Design a binder for this molecule. Structure first.
Ligand code: ZN
Ligand code: ZN
Lengths: 268, 271
């Protein structure tokens, strides 16, 4: 019969023996210490780089904003910085992974666009797509973030479109399944993340839906953000579910209104 | 061959034709307006309820210290809130929808607290021999705290679970077997996955066995606060058995989330 074994039950209760405010502050202190100088004195070289501000171990969207034209011109420089500094890149990748997994909804949308715009730029210049660089390497993080936030909404929305469920889209990972902006974002990110996870040497352009001799003309920078905000707004015109309208609305307008009832902690 | 069809490419490119700063302000306005009075005329009745503060469309952010209860207080006052949930299905569905959104956007410490809130609530129901109902706002949003914690801890747990000789995160949440529980991490994810599964299957009431509790038993193995205390602990101690620098970095940044590095640009050509 399936059950929690006796010894494990003791392990779980024994948590109380080592739980205390003091112990918590000491444990936090050790993690805080790690975050003080994570690059350990081997940051990205920033000499003569236009990306120096974001290469340092020192984020405001508007402050770090670039036009597409600027990304085309200076993109290769950042690409070369990533490729030429493996230790810093692994550091950066680890940190970026955590950032993307805790970003709010608007921030997550921007990270999705940062990812695809970065791929668009590489394809524009006929550069290989490098799974090991910090941006492509953390595709799964923004995918996971967006899936967690949008899953309830997409359960209804994707049904209205007559499309596969979110889980199905992300497991099938077929270009042929893309029929709207939601399926585009999740299928492409899922395809990209899957290639990264398998540890391929480089990522085929077809992964991004780009054929031989073509470029990523069907994606414009900002489309993830603009597109997903729009359907969160417009789906209510075709849907009679109040629960759905609340869900869509609260994603777009996140200030807390209701839903927490108590905090109970007997241990510290 | 596998390709993005031409019709869909038209749809995708047309996003630009409608994208504008104004349009975004208008859309945000419509969502903000819904959130002005989400219970829309049918709030929880709160007369002579000790839970009145958290039953209204509150005016400001949830305060963990103000809304703190001892286990003894939860046992005493729990049945009242339970009765309010069960007695007001329309208000409860509204509450459940909002809580689901909250839990899916909470930060790591908040997520831990919501896991304990969920399990302590279950333990209180079991204490009183009350049915576990999927329509209950707290039980009903189990999947939300599950998804959030999984998103945040997945890279850490890949290494940690392997060191403990346990199943992977995905396997744990797929198999959903009590026999796979051998530590706090597997406990939290297996139990939440089991509970979330019963919720989505729309059962009348959820068997206590779902939470690993047999006939007449009281969930002795769970102490309120164990999710938060336990998971904070392993994020601290795993580095002692693991030689990986980047794993230590991952664990530390989860515990200490202020931004340091990792974002490179913002590019939006549409608005
Ligand atoms: Zn809907
Ligand atoms: Zn490790």
């Amino acid at each position: 019969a399936d059950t929690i074994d006796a010894t494990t039950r003791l392990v779980l209760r024994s948590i109380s023996e080592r739980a205390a405010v003091d112990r918590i502050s000491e444990s936090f202190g050790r993690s805080a210490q790690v975050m003080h100088d994570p690059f350990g004195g081997q940051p990205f070289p920033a000499a003569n780089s236009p990306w120096a501000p974001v290469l340092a171990g020192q984020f405001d969207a508007e402050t770090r904003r670039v036009s597409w034209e600027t990304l085309v011109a200076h993109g290769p420089s950042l690409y070369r910085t990533f490729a030429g500094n493996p230790r810093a890149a692994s550091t950066a990748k680890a940190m970026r992974d955590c950032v993307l997994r805790q970003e709010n909804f608007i921030e997550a949308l921007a990270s999705a666009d940062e990812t695809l715009a970065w791929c668009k730029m590489c394809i524009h210049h006929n550069l290989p797509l490098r799974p090991q660089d910090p941006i492509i390497g953390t595709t799964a993080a923004v995918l996971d973030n967006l899936a967690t936030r949008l899953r309830p909404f997409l359960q209804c929305y994707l049904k209205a479109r007559g499309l596969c469920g979110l889980d199905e889209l992300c497991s099938r990972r077929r270009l042929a399944d893309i029929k709207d902006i939601a399926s585009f974002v999740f299928v492409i990110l899922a395809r990209l993340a899957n290639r990264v996870e398998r540890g391929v040497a480089e990522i085929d352009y077809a992964t991004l839906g780009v054929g031989v001799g073509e470029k990523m003309h069907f994606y414009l920078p900002g489309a993830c953000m603009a597109g997903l905000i729009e359907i969160l707004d417009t789906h209510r015109q075709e849907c009679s579910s109040r629960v759905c309208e609340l869900t869509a609305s609260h994603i777009v307008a996140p200030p807390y209104v209701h839903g927490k009832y108590f905090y109970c902690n007997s241990l510290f």
